[PDB]
Design a protein around this ligand. Structure first.
Ligand SMILES: Cc1cc2nc3c(=O)[nH]c(=O)nc-3n(C[C@H](O)[C@H](O)[C@H](O)COP(=O)(O)O)c2cc1C
Ligand SMILES: Cc1cc2nc3c(=O)[nH]c(=O)nc-3n(C[C@H](O)[C@H](O)[C@H](O)COP(=O)(O)O)c2cc1C
Lengths: 346, 346
């Protein structure tokens, strides 16, 4: 597997937007034998390029860069904005523009990734045109795409990608569904089941994602057909993580004892710890991405500035309670040991 | 592990009510080295006892018997019944009595299980008084209880049970939650995550349940801390299964491409293939068990009699598409081979 041949351990640090995946995090994972990732989501092409440059200065080992697929245009947003009037007033800020870009600098970002190739590139919220994948392949870049159902996985393979990321419902953060509709609500697939379905649906390598916090779980997905495990929440609380202090603390806080998928913050299903904002607006959030994300960004930044976890997008997978606060490099070592220990037992 | 010492393969055939787990099914699983189960749910104490007697005549190997915990009493039911008036008329039958028993012959069933001990007894919909568990233990019976969260698992251990069954959201049929409330809605835990949480929460053996259809998935849960895998849907479509023909056929029917948790049929969250009945009544089903189950039984029986899968409780886990129609004994062999193959690879 070209992917696994790139790095020693079957461990991938999930790209996490919102200032989480700073170069220092990716670098530590890379130096420990795992695959570090940079998140291009919501950044400008230049912002992404600067991180890429900095990371190369921190490590010479393979790393990945994640990009968001452009979303098509399209009452609901006007109403939700109105319902947030109180949040804007309380945080003394203005809601963001729901009609901003929807491509997230896609064209410019691909230009950078093609002109100065990186080892790995993954896509979220859909599948790239097969010409984008072919061109990146020629450049020597391995391509990955997230799928949440066996059908989406088939689409990923059909596009010619090198590997598919099977993200189960337990996953923290944004669900990588290709198309969001109120019907998918309540129909999310558990990772162990999704992995098996995807493994029999496609022939390309599968990277398992969702709720993986221990080395034993990494051994579990490998046993079920995965080539590697992608972990987000586990690295979210490491020291190199750029996630706000209130967010890191919430992960193990008994007060935030539950997570759930919501469109409250971005307008697309994403798993977050249940808090005030989710409770109040979660039931009414419309399917409109990145429209809603633009709308609530000022709110989230204001909340983070104040240290108010109740107004933040507390992204977290179902294994958040097992999050460990230590250097990412040491976390990889611990994970590797747990993995070995589980293989031996099995 | 006293449990695993009982039978050679880490495979448990889940007890399945509704006439699915006939003695012939349990026997075939037992003879193949797995642990067969009889379902006492909704049967009378005598009905259960007759199956127990018959199964002993079919195999001398260890088997289990599953019993439902009595439920406490408690507008919603009156309204739901009204909404089903059309179903009753169409199927030309009368709705059942929502105020029937709620103990499901618990006292009488325990009397039988204590007077003539069986190898294993599992409980669903709660945890038995620790005196019930202690008495069964003295009789030489191993006890298991289903938990859906790490907290419920702790309760299972605290009661002194020999092992806990960690049932994830992917599971087919009835969720074994100890207490049902509209809050749990949307907060189900994926098996891979639940298993890890339960393994660190308790010290007793864990049996993993939910979406397991292949031997590789059995290797997966074992690697994550489970002592065995409990499979329902995989055995539901075997020849020895007593499930109606329309139910077995629906499992691999492209028309029924999705499952979801609903209270439509029983008044408690249970995963079923999405069909007409679920679509029409699922959004309005109240939390009232076994009240709703009593209410819809006549409807379900009428639908089954007519071969109308759209009016049946098509219980099925998320791996239903991988269901194989063959003797249960051969399914165990195939599962065992897949398991070995996965261990070797890992
Ligand atoms: C903090 C937060 C931010 C995330 N941001 C991204 C992102 O920008 N792009 C992406 O492809 N996935 C993103 N993910 C999803 C991860 O790729 C992965 O699917 C998820 O973290 C797996 O669950 P645990 O978090 O490992 O349960 C994010 C997840 C969280 C935790
Ligand atoms: C046909 C149907 C009926 C079931 N009946 C029972 C039951 O009476 N008692 C019980 O404890 N579990 C029952 N279960 C749940 C199983 O114990 C197990 O948790 C579930 O089948 C696991 O998922 P798959 O079905 O293995 O995904 C039933 C499941 C289905 C498939």
């Amino acid at each position: 597997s070209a992917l696994t041949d790139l790095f020693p351990l079957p461990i991938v640090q999930a790209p996490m937007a919102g200032g989480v995946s700073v170069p220092q995090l990716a670098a530590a994972v890379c130096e420990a034998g795992g695959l570090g990732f940079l998140a291009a989501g919501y950044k400008t092409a230049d912002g992404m390029y600067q991180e890429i440059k900095r990371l190369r200065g921190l490590t010479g080992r393979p790393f990945g860069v994640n990009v968001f697929m452009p979303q098509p245009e399209l009452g609901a947003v006007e109403v939700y904005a109105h319902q947030l009037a109180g949040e804007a007033a309380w945080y003394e800020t203005e809601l963001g523009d729901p009609d901003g870009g929807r491509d997230d600098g896609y064209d410019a970002k691909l230009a950078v990734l093609l002109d100065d190739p990186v080892p790995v590139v993954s896509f979220h919220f859909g599948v790239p045109d097969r010409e984008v994948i072919a061109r990146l392949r020629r450049a020597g870049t391995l391509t990955l795409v997230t799928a949440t159902t066996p059908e989406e996985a088939r689409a990923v393979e059909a596009a010619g990608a090198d590997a598919v990321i099977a993200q189960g419902v337990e996953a923290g953060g944004d669900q990588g569904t290709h198309r969001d509709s109120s019907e998918d609500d309540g129909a999310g697939i558990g990772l162990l089941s999704l992995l098996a379905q995807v493994r029999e649906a496609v022939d390309i390598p599968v990277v398992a994602a969702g709720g993986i916090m221990r080395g034993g779980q990494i051994a579990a997905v490998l046993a079920a057909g995965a080539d590697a495990a992608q972990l987000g929440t586990a690295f979210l609380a490491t020291d190199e993580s750029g996630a706000p202090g209130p967010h890191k603390r919430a992960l193990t806080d008994p007060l935030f004892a539950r997570t759930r998928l919501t469109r409250a913050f971005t307008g697309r299903p994403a798993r977050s710890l249940v808090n005030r904002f989710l409770r109040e607006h979660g039931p009414y959030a419309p399917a409109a991405y990145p429209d809603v994300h633009h709308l609530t960004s000022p709110l989230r930044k204001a909340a983070a500035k104040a240290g108010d976890a109740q107004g933040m997008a507390l992204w977290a997978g179902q294994g958040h309670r097992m999050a460990r606060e230590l250097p990412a490099g040491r976390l990889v070592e611990v994970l590797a040991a747990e993995l070995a220990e589980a293989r031996t037992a099995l």
